[PDB]
Amino acid sequence: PKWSLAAAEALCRVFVRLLAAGTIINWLRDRLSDYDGVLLSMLQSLAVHALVLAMAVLKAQAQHLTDREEAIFPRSFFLEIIAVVLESPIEHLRGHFSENFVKKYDDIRFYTFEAIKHFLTEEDVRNNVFNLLLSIEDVPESNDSLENFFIERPPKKKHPLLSLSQHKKQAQEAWLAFMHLGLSKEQRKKVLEVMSASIAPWFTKPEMLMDFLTDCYNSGGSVSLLALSGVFYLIQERNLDYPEFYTKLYSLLDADILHSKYRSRFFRLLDTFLASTHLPAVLVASFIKRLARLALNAPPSAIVVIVPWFYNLFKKHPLTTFMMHRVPRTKEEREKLEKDGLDDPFLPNETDPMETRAIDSCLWEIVQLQSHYHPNVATICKIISEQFTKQAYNLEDFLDHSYGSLLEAEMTKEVKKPPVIEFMIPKHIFTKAAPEEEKKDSLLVSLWDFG
Amino acid sequence: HFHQVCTPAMLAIARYLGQKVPAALSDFAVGIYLSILALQYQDFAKRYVPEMMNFLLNTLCALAPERAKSKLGNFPVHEPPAGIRIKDATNTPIRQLNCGDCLRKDELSPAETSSLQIAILSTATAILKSAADTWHKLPAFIESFQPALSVAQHLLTKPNASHLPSSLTSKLNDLASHLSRLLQLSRLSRRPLELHHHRPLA
Amino acid sequence: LGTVLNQALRTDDSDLLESCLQTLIIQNTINRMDSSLAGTLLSKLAARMHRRPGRAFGLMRWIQWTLVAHGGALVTQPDLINRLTELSRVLEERSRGLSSLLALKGKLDMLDAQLKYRKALKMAG
Amino acid sequence: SLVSGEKTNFNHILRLLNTNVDGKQKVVYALTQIKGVGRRYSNLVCKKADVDLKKRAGELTSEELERLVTIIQNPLAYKI
Amino acid sequence: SPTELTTLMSCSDDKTVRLWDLPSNDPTRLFTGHTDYVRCGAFMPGSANSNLLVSGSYDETVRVWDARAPGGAVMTFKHADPIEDVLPLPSGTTLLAASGNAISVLDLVAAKPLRLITNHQKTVTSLSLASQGRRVVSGSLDGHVKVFETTSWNVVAGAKYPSPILSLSVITAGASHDDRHLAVGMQSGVLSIRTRLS
């Protein structure tokens, strides 16, 4: 059917020529309505070029199917094109549509959004529309940032194609129609990931996102960890509030947060949540003591994130530095402390950080994490031990570390500077007893039967 | 301190030991093997392996006579998906692990699963014994081994001791008394931190 | 829009209240609204309906769904029936003038019928 | 209980072309610290880059800091 | 100090409030008792209240001291929130402690709290007295100023600013103290002065 594609590129040239030039006229106006189904069937074949034909015929129909100077182009035919594009199981068709037109032009963006709203008002197809709605990452900044139109840059000076609030309005309306139909689990866990950079800046008013975010943030689990960036963006931009924000953060950082994948985004948010100036010493000490007792069971790619952040907090708030250097001021306290040992007055599993007694506690957890098996973790747990010389540690050098990075760290060095081995190797590596050598057995062998 | 070959093996044990929610009993066995291997790495260089700690407490709660209800450590408690937990079989005695338990068997008999699970619990009690004896230093002893005592006392309960033999009860009560003695030792030996006692420059 | 409406009616905002009033959504909003701010919503809707007559459809829709959703929530209040009293006053004023306005509607419907008849003649001629 | 401290970390040592030490003093007294740069020269540099004499060093964004490090390389490209 | 010209007070970040005199190089009196950051404080105006000091801390405590006996606080009021602002009333009897999402009027004559007034969503930052000592204008992180009466403490009027505001004062003209203009300093870095001329 390559010759039918050749006939299509010929007939499209004939159509744009007769339109750009121009009982007798009714067949001339029958032509395009007969060619519409031809291109609709050609969009299910290569339809990659048929889309270029289908987006040139719209340019011709805008330019000269009217007596007015204003180019009015058919939203209904564009809606049928959208309804076949978002339904066809080809990936490269929608890919060509997204890269070549929607990320490039603005008329296609606005009318695509309102066509999507109609098409969604009237599950694989749901995934297709969601993958198209995630595609427009960039948001225009101002009215003079639009500045490239496909057909008829309007001379109206107040046109809805020239006001940025109406582009944002139809983007918000398309997204509200999709979220009214209702989204699946991985769709929601993609939305809450890419919300505060790509979804919420499309809204004229994000106040329905406020209720969605506070529902999925008060729910619990990892979805609150995802929703925290959206809640921060909506406290930031248009100051809707969360009621008890810091006790919610204190209940949020818990047993299994440090093992998740989104902890880099979480710690990049916590670095702004705990850089505020209106934080009491009790609160900023509680957020250190819980993240130390949680660092006791953390990955070595998490302690390297935690401890320089501790260093910046200890530089900012010196009243919490009594969790490193506490002197018993009275000799009666010295006698009591040597008679019976000191119980840790920190109260774990306490609700509010201002009433956890993290003040009067110490960082025994960090001074024990100094004897970590990894050398880099063992030497970064010494920044609390040594001296406070550097004025601040940036966290972008310490974030996004994982086991892949920690295990390529032993790869990207030299092949071998000539290492050492262990002299006097015992011959009973696996023998269960070896009673004539007096050297006690491997506990591997004492607890494993090899036979 | 740092080696080019030795501690990357420790990191391989680490990546398999901290991650990997277990999906069968083969993963449990390989995790117990890498836990004792990492103990032998950290003998007479008394360092700390947090992933060994949380993995061992994960196995000790995930063999699950009743359930991990609430307040069992700050370690990530996970789900036994396919009924990977002990049943009421108190007449299969303890045994020592072999290496064939690094093979998956979906067609395994329950009388073959029960001895394996009791074996994994007994050897994990031994690993907690060795880890406590080699880590009775290191002043977050109490904050690291209060979950060990709490999960051991949780396995010494009435809805949990029916499914266990008397030998596992004896091992876990040895764990309880040993950890109580060590915890009283660390409470009486805990002193407050004075890290920054610096010599002023001349 | 429930928490936004809660914020606006609890701190006596105007911008949040108007941006949530200008917009299914209404039913979810009043169902997730707090119970204690329902009388505050009734008074702040009666005020806008008095001050501006052109917004009567949406505001009567809001008042209608509020009285549906939080009916006994206003009875458990009951020393605050004066908000319903001001609401009755505003709706009585809105429904003032109906018989004379119906007479004038008929007097204009005759003219519109004759104008449409002469347009229907003039299109065919 | 959440006010943005996005500006309150400014009294730290900044790094520049040659000197690794350039703290907060002002905007024209910080330019004197670089070797070869003068007290009458530093006022000509600031009037081109639309930076105000009232501000300090450290009160500048990551874009506005480097604009003074290009114009310190080539004094001929910007007219003099 | 509103009466003496050389006496001043200081609430520092650690635990201390303390009285200085301008000729001396030493603090004349020291007051401890707070357990967190103390960040708002004022003298007590009045003919009888010559030397009393109020300061609230971030430990959810308002303490008022006699300056004659430098022991503990004379009176202490424990709140639920980190206390952001404090102002006494010009009669010297009552006192407004602004803590979290609520202000609180307290008596100092008989050591009893009167009334907790919550009308802000975010935390209230700064209180100010107004027209003739008759109306208190409060400003919060919600972007809201709200002016209350002093007899019944109802929300009499209010206004909304485009940023979360941090400082607020209505300031007076001169003789008889008619309020000239209200200035709000916001988190965005803007001082908005709104002027009324009569």
Q: Quick check: helix, strand or coil at residue E60?
A: coil
Asked if A246 has any chain D CB less than 8 Å from its own CB, the reply is yes
Beta-carbon separation of A280 and E142 below 8 A? no
Encoded amino acid at A226, one letter? L
Considering only CB atoms, C14 lies closest to which of E146, E155, E160, namely E160
Are A95 and A76 in contact by the 8 Å Cβ rule? The answer is no
Q: Quick check: helix, strand or coil at residue E176?
A: coil
Print burial letters for D16-44: b (CB count within 10 Å at least 16), e (below 16).
beeeeebebebbbebbebbeebeeeebee
Could you please report the per-residue DSSP string of A196-233?
Answer: HHHTGGG-S--HHHHHHHHHHHHH-THHHHHHHHHHHH
Distance from the B191 Cα atom to the nearest Cα atom in chain A, whole angstroms? 6
**Largest Cα–Cα distance of chain D, in whole Å?**
51
Distance between CA atoms of residues B120 and B122, nearest Å = 6
Print burial letters for A134-162: b (CB count within 10 Å at least 16), e (below 16).
eebeebeeeeeebeebbbbbeeeeeeebb
Asked if A244 has any chain D CB less than 8 Å from its own CB, the reply is no
User: What are B19's two structure tokens?
Assistant: 């991650």
Cα distances (Å, whole numbers) of residue D76 to A62, D17, D28, D45, D79: 53, 18, 20, 12, 6
Are C30 and C36 in contact by the 8 Å Cβ rule? The answer is no
Q: Quick check: helix, strand or coil at residue A350?
A: coil
- Length of chain D counted residue by residue: 80
Q: Strand pairing partners for E85?
A: E98
Distance of CA A342 to the CA centre of its chain: 44
If phi over 0 gives left and psi between -120 and 50 gives alpha, with beta otherwise, what is residue A113? alpha
Distance between CA atoms of residues A222 and A257, nearest Å = 8
User: What are B90's two structure tokens?
Assistant: 């108190």
Distance between CA atoms of residues E62 and A260, nearest Å = 42
Cα distances (Å, whole numbers) of residue D11 to D22, D60, D69: 10, 12, 20
Chain position carrying tokens 């840790």: A344
Chain position carrying tokens 């005759």: C110
Cα distances (Å, whole numbers) of residue E173 to E87, E89, E137: 21, 20, 17
Q: Quick check: helix, strand or coil at residue B82?
A: coil
Q: What one-character DSSP code corresponds to residue D14?
A: B
Sign of CA dihedral D33, D36, D39, D45: negative
Touch C-D: 3+ C-beta pairs under 8 A: no
Kindly give, in sequence order, each residue whose CB lies less than 8 Å from that of residue C98, ignoring residues fewer than 6 positions away: none
Distance between CA atoms of residues B81 and B79, nearest Å = 6
Distance of CA A253 to the CA centre of its chain: 18
Distance between CA atoms of residues A257 and A287, nearest Å = 14
Asked if E166 has any chain D CB less than 8 Å from its own CB, the reply is yes
Q: Strand pairing partners for E76?
A: E63
Encoded amino acid at A195, one letter? M
Encoded amino acid at B120, one letter? I
Strand order of the β-sheet with E7-11 is: E7-11, E17-21, E27-31
Are A345 and A286 in contact by the 8 Å Cβ rule? The answer is no
Distance of CA B118 to the CA centre of its chain: 14
Distance of CA E7 to the CA centre of its chain: 19
Distance between CA atoms of residues B152 and E163, nearest Å = 55
Angle at B122 between CA B119 and CA B127, to 5 degrees: 120
Angle at E62 between CA E60 and CA E67, to 5 degrees: 145
Encoded amino acid at A95, one letter? G
Chain position carrying tokens 């929530």: C73
Burial environment of residue A128 by CB neighbours within 10 A (0 to 12, 13 to 18, 19 or more): middle
Q: What one-character DSSP code corresponds to residue E99?
A: E
Burial environment of residue B193 by CB neighbours within 10 A (0 to 12, 13 to 18, 19 or more): buried
Helix count and strand count (H, E) for chain A: 21, 0
Distance of CA B52 to the CA centre of its chain: 7
Burial environment of residue A207 by CB neighbours within 10 A (0 to 12, 13 to 18, 19 or more): buried
Chain position carrying tokens 């690794």: D20
Encoded amino acid at A267, one letter? F
Distance between CA atoms of residues A164 and A150, nearest Å = 16
What is the 3 state secondary structure string of C60-117? Answer: HHHHHHHHHHCHHHHHCCCCCCHHHHHHHHHHHHHCCCHHHHHHHHHHHHHHHHHHHH
Encoded amino acid at E21, one letter? D
Angle at D59 between CA D55 and CA D60, to 5 degrees: 105
Are A225 and A262 in contact by the 8 Å Cβ rule? The answer is yes
Print burial letters for A380-413: b (CB count within 10 Å at least 16), e (below 16).
bbebbeeeeeeeebebeebbebebeebeeeeeee
**How much of chain C is in helix, strand and coil states, percent to nearest 5?**
80, 0, 20
Dihedral of CA atoms A84, A89, A91, A92 in degrees, nearest 10, equals -60
Encoded amino acid at A131, one letter? N
Distance between CA atoms of residues E64 and E58, nearest Å = 15
Burial environment of residue A349 by CB neighbours within 10 A (0 to 12, 13 to 18, 19 or more): exposed
Are A294 and A309 in contact by the 8 Å Cβ rule? The answer is no
Distance between CA atoms of residues A328 and B192, nearest Å = 8
- E59 φ, ψ to 5°? -90, 20
Are E171 and E126 in contact by the 8 Å Cβ rule? The answer is no
Q: Strand pairing partners for E65?
A: E53
Residues 136-165 of E with CB under 8 A from D: 141, 164
Distance between CA atoms of residues A52 and C115, nearest Å = 51
- Length of chain A counted residue by residue: 451
- Length of chain E counted residue by residue: 198
Distance between CA atoms of residues C43 and C48, nearest Å = 9
Strand order of the β-sheet with E102-107 is: E83-88, E94-99, E102-107, E112-117
User: What are D73's two structure tokens?
Assistant: 């390389």
Distance between CA atoms of residues A153 and A173, nearest Å = 23
Encoded amino acid at A310, one letter? F
Q: What one-character DSSP code corresponds to residue A237?
A: S
Q: What one-character DSSP code corresponds to residue A143?
A: G
Chain A residue numbers touching E84 (CB-CB < 8 A): 278
Strand order of the β-sheet with E52-57 is: E38-43, E52-57, E61-66, E75-78
Are A345 and B193 in contact by the 8 Å Cβ rule? The answer is no
Distance from the C123 Cα atom to the nearest Cα atom in chain A, whole angstroms? 22
Encoded amino acid at E73, one letter? A
Chain position carrying tokens 């050389």: E6
Beta-carbon separation of C32 and A208 below 8 A? no
Beta-carbon separation of C7 and E144 below 8 A? no
Cα distances (Å, whole numbers) of residue A19 to A29, A37, A56, A81: 11, 19, 12, 21
CA atoms within 13 A on the CB side of B147: 28
Print burial letters for E91-104: b (CB count within 10 Å at least 16), e (below 16).
ebbbbbbbbbbbbb
Kindly give, in sequence order, each residue whose CB lies less than 8 Å from that of residue A174, ignoring residues fewer than 6 positions away: A113, A114, A116, A117, A120, A133
> Which partners does chain C have (≥3 C-beta pairs < 8 Å)?
A, E
Alpha helices in A279-330 (DSSP H): 281-293, 300-316
User: What are E157's two structure tokens?
Assistant: 């009027």
* Bridge-based pairing state of the strands E94-99 and E17-21: unpaired
- C106 φ, ψ to 5°? -65, -40
Chain E residue numbers touching A239 (CB-CB < 8 A): 122, 141-143, 164
Distance between CA atoms of residues C14 and E159, nearest Å = 9
Distance from the E15 Cα atom to the nearest Cα atom in chain A, whole angstroms? 10
**Could you tell me which chain A residue has the CA closest to the CA of E60?**
A354
Are B145 and B165 in contact by the 8 Å Cβ rule? The answer is no
Chain C residue numbers touching E158 (CB-CB < 8 A): 12
Distance between CA atoms of residues A295 and A258, nearest Å = 8
CA atoms within 13 A on the CB side of E77: 29
Helix count and strand count (H, E) for chain D: 2, 0
User: What are C46's two structure tokens?
Assistant: 């009666």
